[PDB]
Every structure is written in C-alpha cells, then in structure tokens.
Amino acid sequence: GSEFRLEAERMRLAEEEKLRKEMSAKKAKEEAERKHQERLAQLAREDAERELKEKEEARRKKELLEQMEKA
C-alpha cells in the first residue's frame, strides 16, 4: 500500500500546486484590470475638472470685463 498512498499523496500535492499556480493568475488578472479602470477614471476626471476650470475661468473674466466696460 505505501506506493499507492505515495501516489495519492503526490497527486493531491500536484493539485494544491496547480491551484496555487492559478489562484495566483486570477489575482493578477484582477489587479491588471484594477489599475486599468482606476487609471481610466482618473484621466476622465482630471479632464472634466480641467474642462470645467477653463470654462469658468473664462466666464468669470467675461463678466468681469463687461462690468468694467460699464464706465
């Protein structure tokens, strides 16, 4: 029986091994897509706040100059 128990213990170890090799892959494919989406929303936000400052920095200096022209 020893050689048959050796073979079923060896098989269970290879199995635990390849789980480890593949929960490891799942995590890294989950993290890749995390920095991806975080990077894509960061860029979407900076762009909206740059857009918005430019829009309102302009409006303000518009209303400013037009009150200045009132003299």
Grouping H, G, I as helix, E, B as strand and the rest as coil, residue 69 is: coil
How far apart, in whole angstroms, are the C-alpha atoms of residue 37 and residue 25? 19
Residue 49 belongs to what domain range?
1-71
Extract long-range pairs of 38-44: CB within 8 Å, 24+ residues apart: none
How far apart, in whole angstroms, are the C-alpha atoms of residue 19 and residue 49? 45
The pair of three-digit structure tokens given for residue 55, joined into one six-digit string: 């829009």
Number of domains making up the chain: 1
